[PDB]
């Protein structure tokens, strides 16, 4: 895959929006994990949280790498989630589905070579915020 971290300061969207947790800190640069230092995402709690980036553009897309919020003993809340790629459409072209991070700070997805203006992750539990301390996205090797 390509070391450009093509999400970077793409236009991001979440379910709703909490503790003034804007969408757009997980795409802004800085995978620092501690809330208070304003770089972690985060939406009400609620069901089925999601958060999203727009591409821009439809890209071959490679790995996704998340990035846990790591203060306050919650990072247990990126459980139970899919990390999905749609086209410009926004039809699914790929969703994969994971059960923990097993407390590691961050999770690497490898989608093979998928063409995709869309990346989105889906919590599937109930009553519970989505927060992102960063989300790269990088382009297939050629
Ligand atoms: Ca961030
Ligand atoms: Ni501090």
Do not use: C, M
């Not at 439809?58 to 790591?70: D, F, I, P, Q």
């Not at 072209?93 to 998928?114: C, I, M, P």
């Amino acid at each position: 895959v390509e070391t450009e971290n093509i999400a970077r300061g793409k236009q991001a969207s979440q379910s709703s929006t909490a503790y003034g947790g804007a969408a757009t800190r997980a795409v802004d640069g800085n995978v620092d994990s501690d809330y208070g230092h304003h770089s972690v995402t985060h939406t009400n709690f609620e069901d089925n949280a999601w958060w999203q980036v727009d591409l821009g553009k439809t890209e071959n897309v490679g790995k996704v790498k998340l990035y846990n919020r790591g203060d306050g003993n919650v990072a247990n809340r990126l459980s139970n989630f899919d990390v999905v790629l749609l086209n410009e459409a926004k039809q699914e072209v790929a969703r994969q589905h994971f059960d923990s991070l097993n407390g590691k700070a961050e999770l690497e997805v490898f989608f093979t070579a998928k063409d995709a203006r869309y990346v989105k992750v889906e919590l599937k539990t109930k009553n519970t915020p989505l927060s992102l301390a960063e989300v790269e996205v990088f382009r297939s090797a050629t």
